[PDB]
CSV table of C-alpha atoms and ligand atoms in Angstrom, one decimal:
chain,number,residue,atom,x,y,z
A,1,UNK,CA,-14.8,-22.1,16.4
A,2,UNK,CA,-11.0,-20.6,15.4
A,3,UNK,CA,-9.3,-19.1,12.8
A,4,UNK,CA,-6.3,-20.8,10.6
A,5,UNK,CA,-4.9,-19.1,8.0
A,6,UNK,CA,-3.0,-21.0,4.7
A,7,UNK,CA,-0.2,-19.4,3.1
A,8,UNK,CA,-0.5,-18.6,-1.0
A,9,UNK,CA,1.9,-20.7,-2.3
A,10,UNK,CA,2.7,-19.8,-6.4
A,11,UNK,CA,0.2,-21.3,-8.9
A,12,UNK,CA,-2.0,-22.1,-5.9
A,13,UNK,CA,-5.8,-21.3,-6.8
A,14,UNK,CA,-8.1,-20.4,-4.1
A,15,UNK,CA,-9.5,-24.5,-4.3
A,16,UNK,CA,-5.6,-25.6,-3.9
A,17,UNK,CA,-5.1,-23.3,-0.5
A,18,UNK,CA,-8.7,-23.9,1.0
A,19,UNK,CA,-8.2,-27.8,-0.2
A,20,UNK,CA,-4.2,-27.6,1.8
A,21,UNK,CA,-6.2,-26.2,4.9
A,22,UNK,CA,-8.4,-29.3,5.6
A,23,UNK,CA,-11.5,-27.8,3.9
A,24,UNK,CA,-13.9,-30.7,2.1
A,25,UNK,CA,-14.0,-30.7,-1.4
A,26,UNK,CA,-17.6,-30.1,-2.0
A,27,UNK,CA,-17.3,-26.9,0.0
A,28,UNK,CA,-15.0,-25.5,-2.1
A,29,UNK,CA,-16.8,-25.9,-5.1
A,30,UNK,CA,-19.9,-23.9,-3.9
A,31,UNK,CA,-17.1,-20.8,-3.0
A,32,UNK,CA,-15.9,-21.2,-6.5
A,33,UNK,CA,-19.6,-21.5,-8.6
A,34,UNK,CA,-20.4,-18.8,-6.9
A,35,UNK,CA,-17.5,-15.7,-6.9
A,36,UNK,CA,-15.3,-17.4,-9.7
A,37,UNK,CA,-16.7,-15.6,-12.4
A,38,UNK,CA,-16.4,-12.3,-10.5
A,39,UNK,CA,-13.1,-12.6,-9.2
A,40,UNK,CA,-10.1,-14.8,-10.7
A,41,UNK,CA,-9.5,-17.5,-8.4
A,42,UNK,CA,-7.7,-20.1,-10.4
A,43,UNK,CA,-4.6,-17.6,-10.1
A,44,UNK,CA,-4.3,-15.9,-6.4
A,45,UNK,CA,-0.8,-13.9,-5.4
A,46,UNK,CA,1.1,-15.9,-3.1
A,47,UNK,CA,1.7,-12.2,-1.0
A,48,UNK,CA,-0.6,-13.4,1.7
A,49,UNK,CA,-2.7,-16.3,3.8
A,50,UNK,CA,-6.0,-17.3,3.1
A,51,UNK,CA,-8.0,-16.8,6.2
A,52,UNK,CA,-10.8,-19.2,7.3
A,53,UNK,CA,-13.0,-19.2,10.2
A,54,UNK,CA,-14.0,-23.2,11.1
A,55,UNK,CA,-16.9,-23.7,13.6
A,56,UNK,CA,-16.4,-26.2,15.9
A,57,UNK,CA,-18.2,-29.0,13.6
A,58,UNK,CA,-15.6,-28.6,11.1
A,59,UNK,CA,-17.4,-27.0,8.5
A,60,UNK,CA,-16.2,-23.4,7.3
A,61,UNK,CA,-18.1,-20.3,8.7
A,62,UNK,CA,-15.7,-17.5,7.3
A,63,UNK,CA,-13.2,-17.3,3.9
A,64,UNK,CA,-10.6,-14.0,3.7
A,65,UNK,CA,-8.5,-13.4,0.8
A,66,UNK,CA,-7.3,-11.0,-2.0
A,67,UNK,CA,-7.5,-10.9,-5.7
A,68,UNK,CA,-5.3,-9.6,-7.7
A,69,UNK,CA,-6.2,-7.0,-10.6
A,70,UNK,CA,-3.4,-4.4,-12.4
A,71,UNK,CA,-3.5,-1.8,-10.3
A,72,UNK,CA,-5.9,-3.0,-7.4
A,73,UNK,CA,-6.4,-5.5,-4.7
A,74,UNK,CA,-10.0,-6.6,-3.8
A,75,UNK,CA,-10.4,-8.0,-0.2
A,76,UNK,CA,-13.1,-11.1,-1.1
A,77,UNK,CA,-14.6,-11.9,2.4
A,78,UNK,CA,-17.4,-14.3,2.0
A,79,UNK,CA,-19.7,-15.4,5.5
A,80,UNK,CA,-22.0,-18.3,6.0
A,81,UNK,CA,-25.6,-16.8,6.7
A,82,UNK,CA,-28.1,-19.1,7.2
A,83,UNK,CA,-25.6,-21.4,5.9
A,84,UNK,CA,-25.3,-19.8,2.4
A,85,UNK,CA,-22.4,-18.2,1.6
A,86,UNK,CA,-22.6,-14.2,1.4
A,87,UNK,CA,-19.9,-11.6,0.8
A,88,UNK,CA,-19.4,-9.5,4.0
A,89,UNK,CA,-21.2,-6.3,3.6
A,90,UNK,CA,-20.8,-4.7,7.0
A,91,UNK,CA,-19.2,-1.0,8.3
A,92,UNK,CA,-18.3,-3.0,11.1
A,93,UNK,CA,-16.8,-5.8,9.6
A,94,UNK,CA,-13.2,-4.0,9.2
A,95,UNK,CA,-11.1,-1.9,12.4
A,96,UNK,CA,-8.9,0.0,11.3
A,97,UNK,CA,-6.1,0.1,14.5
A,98,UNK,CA,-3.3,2.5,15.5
A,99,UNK,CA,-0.2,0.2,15.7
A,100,UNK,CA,3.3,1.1,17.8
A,101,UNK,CA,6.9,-0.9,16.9
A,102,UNK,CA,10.2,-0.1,18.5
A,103,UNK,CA,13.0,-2.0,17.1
A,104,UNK,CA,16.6,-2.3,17.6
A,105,UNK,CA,18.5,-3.6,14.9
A,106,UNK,CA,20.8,-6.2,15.1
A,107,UNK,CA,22.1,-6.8,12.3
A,108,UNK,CA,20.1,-5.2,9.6
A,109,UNK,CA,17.1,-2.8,9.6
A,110,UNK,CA,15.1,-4.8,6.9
A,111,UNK,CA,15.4,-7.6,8.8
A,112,UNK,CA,15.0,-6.5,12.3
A,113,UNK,CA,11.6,-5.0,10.9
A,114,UNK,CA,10.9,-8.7,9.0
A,115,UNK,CA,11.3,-10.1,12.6
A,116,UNK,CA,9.0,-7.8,14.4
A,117,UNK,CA,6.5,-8.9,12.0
A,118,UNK,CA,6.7,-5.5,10.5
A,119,UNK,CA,4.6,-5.9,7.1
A,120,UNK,CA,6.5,-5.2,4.0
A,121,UNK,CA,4.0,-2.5,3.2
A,122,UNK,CA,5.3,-0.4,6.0
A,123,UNK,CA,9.2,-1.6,5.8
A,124,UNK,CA,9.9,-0.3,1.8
A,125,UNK,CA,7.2,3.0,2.7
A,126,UNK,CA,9.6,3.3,5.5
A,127,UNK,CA,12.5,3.1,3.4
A,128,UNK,CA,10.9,5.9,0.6
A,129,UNK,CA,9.6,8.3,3.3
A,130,UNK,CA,13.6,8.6,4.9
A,131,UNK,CA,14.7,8.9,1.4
A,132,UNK,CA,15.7,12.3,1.5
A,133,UNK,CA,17.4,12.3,5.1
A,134,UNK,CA,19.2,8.7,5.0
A,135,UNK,CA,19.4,5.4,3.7
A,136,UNK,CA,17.9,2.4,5.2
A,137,UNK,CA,20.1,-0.3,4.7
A,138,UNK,CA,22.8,2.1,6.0
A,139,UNK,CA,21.4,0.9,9.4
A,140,UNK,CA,23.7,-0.9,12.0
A,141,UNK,CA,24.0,-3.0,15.2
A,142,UNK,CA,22.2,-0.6,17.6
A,143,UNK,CA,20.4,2.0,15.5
A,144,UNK,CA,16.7,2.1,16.0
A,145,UNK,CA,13.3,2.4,14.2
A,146,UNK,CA,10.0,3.5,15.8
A,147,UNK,CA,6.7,2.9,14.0
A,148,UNK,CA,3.2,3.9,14.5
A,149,UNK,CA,0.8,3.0,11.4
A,150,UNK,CA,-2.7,1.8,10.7
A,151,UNK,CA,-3.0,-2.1,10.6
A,152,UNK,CA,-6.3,-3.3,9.4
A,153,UNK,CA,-7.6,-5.9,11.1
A,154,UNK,CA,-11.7,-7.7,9.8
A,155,UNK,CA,-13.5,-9.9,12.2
A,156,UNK,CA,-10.4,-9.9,14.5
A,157,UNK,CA,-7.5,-10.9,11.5
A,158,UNK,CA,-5.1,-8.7,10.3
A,159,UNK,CA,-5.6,-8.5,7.1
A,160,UNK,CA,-3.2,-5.7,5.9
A,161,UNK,CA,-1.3,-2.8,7.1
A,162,UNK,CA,-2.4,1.1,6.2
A,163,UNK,CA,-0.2,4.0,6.5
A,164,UNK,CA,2.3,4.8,8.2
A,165,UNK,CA,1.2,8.1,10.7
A,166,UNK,CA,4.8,8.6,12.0
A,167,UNK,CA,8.0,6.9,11.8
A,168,UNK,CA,11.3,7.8,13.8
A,169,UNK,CA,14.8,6.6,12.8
A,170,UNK,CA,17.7,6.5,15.6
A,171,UNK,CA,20.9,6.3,12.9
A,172,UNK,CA,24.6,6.5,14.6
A,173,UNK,CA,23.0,8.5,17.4
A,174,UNK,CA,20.8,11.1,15.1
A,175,UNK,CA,17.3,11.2,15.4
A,176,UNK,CA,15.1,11.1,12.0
A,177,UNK,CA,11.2,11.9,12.6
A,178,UNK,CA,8.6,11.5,9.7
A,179,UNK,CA,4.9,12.4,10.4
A,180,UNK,CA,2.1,12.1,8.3
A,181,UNK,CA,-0.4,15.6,7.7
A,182,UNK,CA,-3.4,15.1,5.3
A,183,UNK,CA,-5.6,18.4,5.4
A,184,UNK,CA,-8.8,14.5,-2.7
A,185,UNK,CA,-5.4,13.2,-2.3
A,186,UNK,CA,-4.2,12.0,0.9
A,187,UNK,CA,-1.8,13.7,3.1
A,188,UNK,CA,2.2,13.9,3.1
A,189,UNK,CA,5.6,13.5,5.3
A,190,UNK,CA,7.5,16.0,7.3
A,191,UNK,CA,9.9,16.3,10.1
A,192,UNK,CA,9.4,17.7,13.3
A,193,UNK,CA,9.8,21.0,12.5
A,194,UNK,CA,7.0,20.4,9.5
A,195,UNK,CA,9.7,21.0,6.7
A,196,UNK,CA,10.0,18.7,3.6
A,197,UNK,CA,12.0,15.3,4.4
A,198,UNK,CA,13.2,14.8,0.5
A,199,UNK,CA,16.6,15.9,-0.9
A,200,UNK,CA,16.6,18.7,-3.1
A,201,UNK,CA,16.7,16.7,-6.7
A,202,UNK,CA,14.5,13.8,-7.0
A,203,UNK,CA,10.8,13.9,-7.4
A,204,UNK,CA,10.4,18.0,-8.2
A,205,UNK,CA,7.2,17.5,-9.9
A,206,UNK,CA,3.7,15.5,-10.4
A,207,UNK,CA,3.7,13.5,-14.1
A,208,UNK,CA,0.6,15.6,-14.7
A,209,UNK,CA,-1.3,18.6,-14.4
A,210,UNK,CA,-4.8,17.0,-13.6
A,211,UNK,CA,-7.9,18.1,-12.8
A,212,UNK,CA,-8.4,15.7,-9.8
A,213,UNK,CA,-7.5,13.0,-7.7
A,214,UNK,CA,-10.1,10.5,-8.4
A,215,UNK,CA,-8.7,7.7,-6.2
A,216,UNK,CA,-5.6,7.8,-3.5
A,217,UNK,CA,-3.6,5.5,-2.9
A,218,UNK,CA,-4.7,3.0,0.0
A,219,UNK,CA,-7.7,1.0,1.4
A,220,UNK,CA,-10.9,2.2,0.9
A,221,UNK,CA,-14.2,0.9,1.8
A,222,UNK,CA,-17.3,1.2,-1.0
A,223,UNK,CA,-19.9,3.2,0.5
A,224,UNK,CA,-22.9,1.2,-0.2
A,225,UNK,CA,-21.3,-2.4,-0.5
A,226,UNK,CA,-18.7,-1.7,2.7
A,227,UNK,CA,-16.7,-4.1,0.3
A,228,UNK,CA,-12.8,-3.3,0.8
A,229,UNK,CA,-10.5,-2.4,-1.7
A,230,UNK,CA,-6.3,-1.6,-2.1
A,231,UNK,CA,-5.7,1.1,-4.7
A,232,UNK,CA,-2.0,0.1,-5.7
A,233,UNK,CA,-1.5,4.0,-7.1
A,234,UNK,CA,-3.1,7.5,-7.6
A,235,UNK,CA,-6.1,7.9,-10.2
A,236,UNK,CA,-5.9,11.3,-11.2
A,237,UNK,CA,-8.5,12.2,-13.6
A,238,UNK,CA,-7.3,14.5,-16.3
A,239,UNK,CA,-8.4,15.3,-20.4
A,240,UNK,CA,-7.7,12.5,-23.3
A,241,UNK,CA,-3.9,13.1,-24.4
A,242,UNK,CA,-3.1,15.4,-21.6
A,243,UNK,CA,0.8,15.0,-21.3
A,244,UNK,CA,2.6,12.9,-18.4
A,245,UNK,CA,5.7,13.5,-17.4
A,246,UNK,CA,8.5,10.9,-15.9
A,247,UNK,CA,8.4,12.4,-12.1
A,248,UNK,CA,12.2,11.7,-12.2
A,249,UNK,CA,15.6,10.8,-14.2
A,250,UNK,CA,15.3,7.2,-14.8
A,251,UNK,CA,15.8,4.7,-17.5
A,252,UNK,CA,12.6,3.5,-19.2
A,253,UNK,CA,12.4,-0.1,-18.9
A,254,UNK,CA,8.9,-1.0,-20.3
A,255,UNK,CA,6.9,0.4,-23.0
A,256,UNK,CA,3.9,-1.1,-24.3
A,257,UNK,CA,0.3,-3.3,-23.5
A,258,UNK,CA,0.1,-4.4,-19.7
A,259,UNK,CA,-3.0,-6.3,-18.8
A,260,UNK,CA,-5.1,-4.1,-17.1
A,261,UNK,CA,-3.0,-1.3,-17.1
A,262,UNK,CA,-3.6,-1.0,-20.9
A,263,UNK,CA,-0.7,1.3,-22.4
A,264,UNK,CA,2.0,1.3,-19.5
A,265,UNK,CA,5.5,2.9,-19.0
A,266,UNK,CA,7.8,1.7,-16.1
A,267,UNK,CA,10.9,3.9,-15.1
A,268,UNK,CA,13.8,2.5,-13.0
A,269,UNK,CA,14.8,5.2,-10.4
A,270,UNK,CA,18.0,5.0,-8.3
A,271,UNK,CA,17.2,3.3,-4.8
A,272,UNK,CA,15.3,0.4,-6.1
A,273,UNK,CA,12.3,2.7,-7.0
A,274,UNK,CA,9.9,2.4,-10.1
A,275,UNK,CA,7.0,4.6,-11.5
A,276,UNK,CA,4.3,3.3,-13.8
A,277,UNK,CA,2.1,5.6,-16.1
A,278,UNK,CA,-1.0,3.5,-17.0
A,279,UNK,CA,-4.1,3.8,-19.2
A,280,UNK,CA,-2.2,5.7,-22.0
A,281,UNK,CA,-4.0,6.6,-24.8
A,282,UNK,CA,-0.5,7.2,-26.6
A,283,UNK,CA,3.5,7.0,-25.8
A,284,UNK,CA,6.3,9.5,-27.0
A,285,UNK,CA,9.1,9.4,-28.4
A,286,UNK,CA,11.4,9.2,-24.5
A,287,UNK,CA,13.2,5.7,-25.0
A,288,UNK,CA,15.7,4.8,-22.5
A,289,UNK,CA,17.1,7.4,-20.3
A,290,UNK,CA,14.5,10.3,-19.0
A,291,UNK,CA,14.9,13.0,-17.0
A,292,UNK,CA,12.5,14.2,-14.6
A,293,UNK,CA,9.8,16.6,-16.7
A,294,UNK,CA,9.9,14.4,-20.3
A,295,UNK,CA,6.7,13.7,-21.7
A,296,UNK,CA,6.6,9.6,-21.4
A,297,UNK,CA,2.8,9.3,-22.8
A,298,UNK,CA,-0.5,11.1,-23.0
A,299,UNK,CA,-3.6,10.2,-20.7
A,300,UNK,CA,-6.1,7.7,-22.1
A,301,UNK,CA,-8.5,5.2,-21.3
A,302,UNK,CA,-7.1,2.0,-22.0
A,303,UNK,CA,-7.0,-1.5,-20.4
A,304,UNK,CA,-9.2,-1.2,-17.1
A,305,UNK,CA,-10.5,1.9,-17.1
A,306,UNK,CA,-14.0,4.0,-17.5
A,307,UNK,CA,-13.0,7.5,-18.2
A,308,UNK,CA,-9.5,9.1,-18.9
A,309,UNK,CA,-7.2,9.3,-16.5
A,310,UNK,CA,-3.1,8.6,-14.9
A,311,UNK,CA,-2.9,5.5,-13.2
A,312,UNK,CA,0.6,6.2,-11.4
A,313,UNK,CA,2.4,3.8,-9.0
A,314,UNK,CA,5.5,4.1,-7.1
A,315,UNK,CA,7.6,0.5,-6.5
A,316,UNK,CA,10.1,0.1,-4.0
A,317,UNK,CA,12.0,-3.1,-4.3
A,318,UNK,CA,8.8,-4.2,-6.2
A,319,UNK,CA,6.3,-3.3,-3.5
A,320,UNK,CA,3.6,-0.6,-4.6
A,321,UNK,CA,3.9,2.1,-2.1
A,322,UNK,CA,1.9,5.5,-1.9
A,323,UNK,CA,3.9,8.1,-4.0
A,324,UNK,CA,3.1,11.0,-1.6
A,325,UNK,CA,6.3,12.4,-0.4
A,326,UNK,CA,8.5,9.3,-2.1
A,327,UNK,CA,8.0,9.6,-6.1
A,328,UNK,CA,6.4,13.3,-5.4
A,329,UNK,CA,7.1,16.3,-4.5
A,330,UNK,CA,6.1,17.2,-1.2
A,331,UNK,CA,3.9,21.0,-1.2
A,332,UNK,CA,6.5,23.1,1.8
A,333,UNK,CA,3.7,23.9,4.4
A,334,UNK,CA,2.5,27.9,5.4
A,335,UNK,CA,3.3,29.4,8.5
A,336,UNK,CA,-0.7,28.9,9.0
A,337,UNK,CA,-0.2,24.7,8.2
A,338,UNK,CA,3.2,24.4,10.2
A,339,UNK,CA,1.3,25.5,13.5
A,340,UNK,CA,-1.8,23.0,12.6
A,341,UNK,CA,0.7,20.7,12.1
A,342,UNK,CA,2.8,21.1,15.3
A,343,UNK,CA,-0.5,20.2,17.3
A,344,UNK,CA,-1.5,17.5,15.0
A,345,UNK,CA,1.6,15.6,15.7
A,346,UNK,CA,2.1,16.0,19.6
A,347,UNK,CA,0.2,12.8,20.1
A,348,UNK,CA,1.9,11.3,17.8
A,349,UNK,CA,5.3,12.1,19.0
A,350,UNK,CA,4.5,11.2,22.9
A,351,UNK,CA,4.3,8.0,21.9
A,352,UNK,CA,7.9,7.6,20.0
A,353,UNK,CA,9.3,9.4,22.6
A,354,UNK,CA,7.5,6.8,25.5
A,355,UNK,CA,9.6,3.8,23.1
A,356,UNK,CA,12.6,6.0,22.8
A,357,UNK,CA,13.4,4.9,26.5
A,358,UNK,CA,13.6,1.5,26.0
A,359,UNK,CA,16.9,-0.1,25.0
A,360,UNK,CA,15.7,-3.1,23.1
A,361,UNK,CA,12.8,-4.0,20.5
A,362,UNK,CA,9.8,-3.6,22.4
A,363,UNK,CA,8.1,-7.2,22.4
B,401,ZN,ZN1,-5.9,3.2,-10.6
């Protein structure tokens, strides 16, 4: 038995990558029967490899993939049991595992990071958390970036990377530290000192005021199905026609129906960053430029949704990232939190500081 994994080429349905990776035709149509009118698998995002585990026969024991729906990413991982195929339904089936990266950049940060294999999820949250203290592709020759996030790995294959838990940033000889505190949103980014990492301006204010959080950002597992699941934003749950609010200037640069999203507004921001307001129930008048605090739109229900709420979503360079502490405003921590925080981190920061040592990307 061993694993191969196909990349998602454009256009490619799931039958076109599990037909590229050697797997017989009839087997393919009993994965399709039986999902395909569940999940869309004549059109798969080519952001990713199809993973399948082969027994030593030749026969498929194990199919991995994600499908795509506007604003969420659905991990389909079907097993052979008994020979039939079933969707994984196990607390066990998915680790979620601490990962370290020390890089030196050679000639650029993006990709040095690429090279180290360090997922695009983590390289444009990188690049949004620093935000505030430096840019990213101001990088050079010799500058360093340390890394510790979650990677999620199920039955042994990394599937997808989490968040980042700290980050540290070596630029022309100055030392940038980012570390994550969560204490039902998840948590947020400061320095070592536990003081807000983002620049004055910016992202001064949530595009709502909401009576929830009904979904964070991130990969959850479904309590009952242990099915996995990528929310590509923050659900906050607030009244039909509440106002939203474009978190910062920006020039409006969609307006209108988007699939799933139902009534949608997209704002360019400066650093290749974009916000989306979905599920509208209504737009306003803001055309063109905003400013951080105009109404955009007013809370609905539309496209995928069941009751009213924001869908919001923060792009960097086109890559959904979690808006905590990039397209929002970061809550300055008590006395009480900074000490709570101080402790919470010193495991954290051992580690960075181990990789500081080193002179080269640690390989
Ligand atoms: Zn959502």
């Amino acid at each position: 038995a061993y694993w191969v994994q196909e990349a998602v080429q454009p256009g490619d349905s799931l039958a076109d990558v599990l037909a590229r990776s050697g797997m017989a035709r009839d087997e393919i149509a009993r994965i399709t029967e039986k999902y395909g009118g569940e999940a869309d698998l004549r059109h798969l995002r080519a952001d990713q490899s199809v993973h399948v585990l082969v027994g030593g026969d030749g026969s498929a024991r194990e199919v991995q993939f994600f499908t795509d729906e506007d604003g969420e990413r659905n991990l389909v991982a079907l097993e052979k049991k008994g020979g039939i195929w079933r969707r994984s339904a196990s607390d066990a089936d998915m680790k979620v595992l601490p990962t370290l990266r020390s890089v030196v950049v050679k000639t650029s940060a993006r990709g040095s990071l690429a090279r180290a294999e360090v997922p695009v999820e983590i390289r444009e949250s990188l690049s949004g958390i620093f935000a505030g203290r430096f840019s990213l592709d101001g990088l050079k020759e010799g500058d360093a970036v340390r890394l510790l996030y979650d990677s999620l790995y199920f039955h042994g294959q990394q599937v997808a990377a989490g968040d980042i838990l700290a980050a540290e940033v070596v630029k022309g000889g100055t030392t940038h530290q980012a570390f994550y505190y969560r204490s039902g949103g998840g948590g947020n980014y400061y320095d070592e000192d536990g003081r807000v990492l983002q620049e004055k301006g910016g992202f001064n204010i949530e595009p709502l005021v909401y009576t929830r959080i009904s979904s964070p950002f991130g990969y959850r597992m479904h309590p009952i199905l242990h099915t996995w699941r990528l929310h590509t934003g923050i659900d906050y749950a607030a009244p039909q026609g509440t106002p939203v609010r474009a978190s910062a200037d920006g020039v409006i640069t969609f307006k209108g129906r988007k699939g799933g999203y139902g009534n949608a507004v997209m704002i360019r921001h400066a650093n290749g960053v974009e916000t989306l307001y979905a599920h509208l129930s209504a737009f306003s008048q803001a055309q063109g430029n905003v400013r951080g605090g105009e109404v955009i739109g007013f809370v609905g229900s539309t496209g995928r949704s069941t009751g009213p709420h924001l869908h919001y979503e923060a792009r960097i360079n086109g890559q959904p990232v979690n808006p905590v502490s990039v397209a929002l405003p970061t809550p300055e921590l008590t006395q009480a939190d900074k000490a709570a925080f101080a402790a919470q981190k010193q495991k954290a920061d051992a580690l960075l500081a181990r990789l500081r040592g080193i002179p080269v990307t640690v390989s």
